[PDB]
Write an enzyme that holds these catalytic residues in place. Structure first.
Site, PDB file in Angstrom:
ATOM      1  N   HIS A 186       0.845  -1.219   0.000  1.00 27.35           N
ATOM      2  CA  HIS A 186       0.000   0.000   0.000  1.00 27.35           C
ATOM      3  C   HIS A 186       0.862   1.243   0.000  1.00 27.35           C
ATOM      4  CE1 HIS A 186      -3.239  -2.740   1.410  1.00 27.35           C
ATOM      5  NE2 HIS A 186      -3.903  -1.988   0.547  1.00 27.35           N
ATOM      6  N   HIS A 192       1.679   1.350  -5.709  1.00 22.53           N
ATOM      7  CA  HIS A 192       0.239   0.983  -5.763  1.00 22.53           C
ATOM      8  C   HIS A 192      -0.572   2.186  -6.231  1.00 22.53           C
ATOM      9  CE1 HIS A 192      -3.657  -0.651  -4.775  1.00 22.53           C
ATOM     10  NE2 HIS A 192      -3.853   0.259  -3.848  1.00 22.53           N
ATOM     11  N   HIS A 234      -5.790   7.543  -3.174  1.00 24.09           N
ATOM     12  CA  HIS A 234      -6.844   6.690  -2.561  1.00 24.09           C
ATOM     13  C   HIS A 234      -6.308   5.949  -1.331  1.00 24.09           C
ATOM     14  CE1 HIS A 234      -5.049   3.217  -4.432  1.00 24.09           C
ATOM     15  NE2 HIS A 234      -5.865   2.468  -3.700  1.00 24.09           N
ATOM     16  N   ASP A 235      -4.993   5.777  -1.186  1.00 26.06           N
ATOM     17  CA  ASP A 235      -4.412   5.004  -0.045  1.00 26.06           C
ATOM     18  C   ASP A 235      -3.412   5.864   0.760  1.00 26.06           C
ATOM     19  OD1 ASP A 235      -5.734   2.463   0.252  1.00 26.06           O
ATOM     20  OD2 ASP A 235      -4.542   1.622  -1.423  1.00 26.06           O
ATOM     21  N   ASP A 245      -8.388  -0.501  -8.140  1.00 27.24           N
ATOM     22  CA  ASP A 245      -7.733  -0.940  -6.891  1.00 27.24           C
ATOM     23  C   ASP A 245      -7.341  -2.407  -6.980  1.00 27.24           C
ATOM     24  OD1 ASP A 245      -6.638  -0.246  -4.418  1.00 27.24           O
ATOM     25  OD2 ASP A 245      -8.505  -0.593  -3.359  1.00 27.24           O
ATOM     26  N   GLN A 288      -6.599 -17.553  -3.152  1.00 33.01           N
ATOM     27  CA  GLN A 288      -6.685 -16.778  -4.415  1.00 33.01           C
ATOM     28  C   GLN A 288      -7.947 -17.192  -5.166  1.00 33.01           C
ATOM     29  OE1 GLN A 288      -4.280 -14.234  -5.511  1.00 33.01           O
ATOM     30  NE2 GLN A 288      -4.071 -14.534  -3.303  1.00 33.01           N
TER      31      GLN A 288
HETATM   32  O1  LIG Z   1      -4.660  -6.818  -5.717  1.00 28.36           O
HETATM   33  C1  LIG Z   1      -5.294  -6.981  -4.654  1.00 28.36           C
HETATM   34  N1  LIG Z   1      -5.558  -5.932  -3.806  1.00 28.36           N
HETATM   35  C2  LIG Z   1      -6.268  -6.073  -2.653  1.00 28.36           C
HETATM   36  C3  LIG Z   1      -6.686  -7.326  -2.321  1.00 28.36           C
HETATM   37  C4  LIG Z   1      -7.476  -7.384  -1.093  1.00 28.36           C
HETATM   38  C5  LIG Z   1      -7.688  -8.601  -0.409  1.00 28.36           C
HETATM   39  C6  LIG Z   1      -8.446  -8.621   0.760  1.00 28.36           C
HETATM   40  N2  LIG Z   1      -8.939  -7.469   1.209  1.00 28.36           N
HETATM   41  C7  LIG Z   1      -8.761  -6.294   0.589  1.00 28.36           C
HETATM   42  C8  LIG Z   1      -8.029  -6.205  -0.589  1.00 28.36           C
HETATM   43  C9  LIG Z   1      -6.344  -8.485  -3.112  1.00 28.36           C
HETATM   44  C10 LIG Z   1      -5.671  -8.286  -4.297  1.00 28.36           C
HETATM   45  C11 LIG Z   1      -5.207  -9.386  -5.238  1.00 28.36           C
HETATM   46  C12 LIG Z   1      -5.770 -10.738  -4.823  1.00 28.36           C
HETATM   47  C13 LIG Z   1      -5.126 -11.183  -3.542  1.00 28.36           C
HETATM   48  C14 LIG Z   1      -3.733 -11.121  -3.449  1.00 28.36           C
HETATM   49  C15 LIG Z   1      -3.086 -11.543  -2.274  1.00 28.36           C
HETATM   50  C16 LIG Z   1      -3.857 -12.012  -1.196  1.00 28.36           C
HETATM   51  C17 LIG Z   1      -5.259 -12.054  -1.328  1.00 28.36           C
HETATM   52  C18 LIG Z   1      -5.902 -11.647  -2.494  1.00 28.36           C
HETATM   53 MG   LIG Z   2      -7.219   1.219   0.602  1.00 29.48          MG
HETATM   54 ZN   LIG Z   3      -5.625   0.629  -2.831  1.00 33.63          ZN
END
Ligand SMILES: O=c1[nH]cc(-c2ccncc2)cc1CCc1ccccc1
Ligand SMILES: [Mg+2]
Ligand SMILES: [Zn+2]
Length: 313
Positions: free
Chosen positions: A68, A72, A106-107, A217, A269
């Site tokens: 983050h 990003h 946004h972050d 995002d 995933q």
């Molecule tokens: O690119 C991403 N950004 C944010 C998220 C995320 C996951 C959970 N909560 C909030 C945002 C997951 C991905 C990609 C998929 C992913 C990768 C790695 C771990 C788990 C999932």
């Molecule tokens: Mg965020």
């Molecule tokens: Zn973000």
């Protein structure tokens, strides 16, 4: 204003594509961002001196966390840029201005932890903002940076345009709260199938821009497999640190955040692509058909994770 920004040939071509990677050279990210604003909004929508000062203050207020971070912020802005360039006529002057800035911001000042951890730790930001904790913080940091002397990139806007753009940015940043995504997509789904979806309805635009923000995002799942896979390492580096911090408070973290349960990553995933990514980009393609490449790439990467489980890599 005769100062265009030009990228090297490969970037100049690759940047237009949804799966562009902005590369490992930090020092080129601001030029990539300015190049996107200029091609997306015009060379005339921001005083360059002010834009450049804003970008560097935004960069300064992203922290050195595994995911983050400043990279990003620019990755998410590039995806938004690819969406706006493939749907030229559907968006107002203000929306284009506002949404790339929303995405860069946004972050802002993310500390590497979920809203959940803030609440359980009892961080001051969780008393100040009961829901969308980090997202109200990020919008707050955006407004702070806009009020630094020589940083108001929106100075030229009418008083009413200024309030419109800060409201677009605020709803845009709040929409990156993935807890708000699920309802927002179900409502868009219903409204597109029943045929009620109307883009002259401001509240309907709001929801659509909310879905785009979720799409931008999550755009790591829409890249070429080696980018997707290597971005997932950085995502898990944060999730696992948060799980460590949960354990430190005496709380068992969800398995996604538990570095003991790395074994379960491929299946995690699968869950995430099926529960989140695929519905997100499916609904987004239905509403904005030129975004189909995001769905296709997401589908290819789900397939790549399926291969990881079946021990084929
Ligand atoms: O690119 C991403 N950004 C944010 C998220 C995320 C996951 C959970 N909560 C909030 C945002 C997951 C991905 C990609 C998929 C992913 C990768 C790695 C771990 C788990 C999932
Ligand atoms: Mg965020
Ligand atoms: Zn973000």
């Amino acid at each position: 204003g005769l100062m265009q920004f030009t990228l090297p040939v490969r970037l100049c071509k690759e940047i237009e594509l949804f799966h562009f990677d902005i590369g490992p050279f930090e020092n080129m990210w601001p030029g990539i961002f300015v190049y996107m604003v200029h091609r997306s909004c015009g060379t005339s929508c921001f005083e360059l001196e002010k834009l450049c000062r804003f970008i560097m203050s935004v960069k300064k207020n992203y922290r050195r966390v595994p995911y983050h971070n400043w990279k990003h912020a620019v990755t998410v802005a590039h995806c938004m840029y690819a969406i706006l360039q493939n749907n030229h006529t559907l968006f107002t002057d203000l929306e284009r201005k506002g949404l790339l800035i929303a995405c860069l911001c946004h972050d802002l000042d993310h500390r590497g932890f979920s809203n959940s951890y803030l609440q359980k730790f009892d961080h001051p930001l969780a008393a100040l903002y009961s829901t969308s904790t980090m997202e109200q913080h990020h919008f707050s940091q955006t407004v702070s940076i806009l009020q630094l002397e020589g940083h108001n990139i929106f100075s030229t806007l009418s008083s009413s345009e200024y309030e419109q753009v800060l409201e677009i940015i605020r709803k845009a940043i709040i929409a990156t709260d993935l807890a708000l995504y699920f309802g927002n997509r179900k409502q868009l789904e219903e409204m597109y199938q029943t045929g009620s979806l109307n883009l002259n309805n401001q509240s309907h635009r709001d929801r659509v821009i909310g879905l785009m923000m979720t799409a931008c995002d999550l755009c790591s799942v829409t890249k070429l497999w080696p980018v997707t896979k290597l971005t997932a390492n950085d995502i898990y580096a944060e999730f696992w640190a948060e799980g460590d911090e949960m354990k430190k408070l005496g709380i068992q973290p969800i398995p996604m955040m538990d570095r003991d349960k790395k074994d379960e990553v491929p299946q995690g995933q699968l869950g995430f692509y099926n529960a989140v990514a695929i519905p997100c980009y499916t609904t987004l393609t239905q509403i904005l058909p030129p975004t189909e490449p995001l769905l296709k790439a997401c589908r290819d990467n789900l397939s790549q994770w399926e291969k990881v489980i079946r021990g084929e890599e």
